[PDB]
């Protein structure tokens, strides 16, 4: 047996595009994968409970191409949150004009199309050989969480829970934060600690976690 696109991946990465265009079957499988790293099959010879250990990254568009600012993301978007609860992260990347930002946008686009070389910043982004090198070395640790950060995390969880529930049942409101939200905050804080390469967690990280989380949907309000 050789497997599909996913099973060639394990302890690695995938990528998907136009998720909304896929079948209900792919949804049935990935609804398993994102939470549990197995796959179950009962078709023929293959009766496995096979190991995936993979990391999903999809993409799609809404129903109308451009956003419906007078509808919610929970109506404008096509996918159900019965699945999307598993989606620890979610950005909403839409576009509205501005006289000034698109000027230097075109500057960027035009310089890259002029010669492939990116903008001549005083900066050198670096080969992926070295990048996978650093990723692999940071994959070696397994840091720790103190209580000094645990308590603050607990309070922020309760804050967001009650806030999003009682307040955000409305126009720009997506669902409700979850335990999975908290688990993801935890995982990502761990990863921050892994990147600083200390075996413990600082309070200076959870701030970036929740910052980035509520930052993901800032452009929903403009």
């Amino acid at each position: 047996l050789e497997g599909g696109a996913l099973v060639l991946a394990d302890n690695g990465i995938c990528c998907i595009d136009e998720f909304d265009k896929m079948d209900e079957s792919d949804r049935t499988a990935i609804h398993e994968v994102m939470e549990q790293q197995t796959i179950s099959i009962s078709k023929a010879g293959i009766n496995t409970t096979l190991n995936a250990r993979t990391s999903i990254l999809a993409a799609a568009n809404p129903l109308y191409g451009r956003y419906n600012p007078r509808l919610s993301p929970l109506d404008n978007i096509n996918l159900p949150a019965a699945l999307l609860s598993r989606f620890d992260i979610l950005f909403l990347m839409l576009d509205i004009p501005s006289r000034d930002d698109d000027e230097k946008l075109a500057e960027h686009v035009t310089y890259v199309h002029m010669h492939n070389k990116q903008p001549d910043l005083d900066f050198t982004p670096v080969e992926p050989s070295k990048m996978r090198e650093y990723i692999a070395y940071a994959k070696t640790k397994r840091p720790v969480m103190s209580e000094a950060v645990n308590d603050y995390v607990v309070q922020a969880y309760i804050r967001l829970r009650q806030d999003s529930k009682r307040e955000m049942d409305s126009k720009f409101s997506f669902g409700q934060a979850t335990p999975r939200t908290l688990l993801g905050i935890i995982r990502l804080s761990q990863a921050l600690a892994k990147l600083r390469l200390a075996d413990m967690v600082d309070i200076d990280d959870v701030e970036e976690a929740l910052r980035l989380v509520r930052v993901s949907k800032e452009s929903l309000y403009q």
Partner: peptide
């Protein structure tokens, strides 16, 4: 016991099948 998931299963792969 065995684990099943979603729509990736069929009567053939549940009752007897021949090979």
């Amino acid at each position: 016991g065995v684990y099943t998931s979603g729509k990736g299963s069929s009567a053939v792969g549940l009752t007897a099948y021949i090979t």
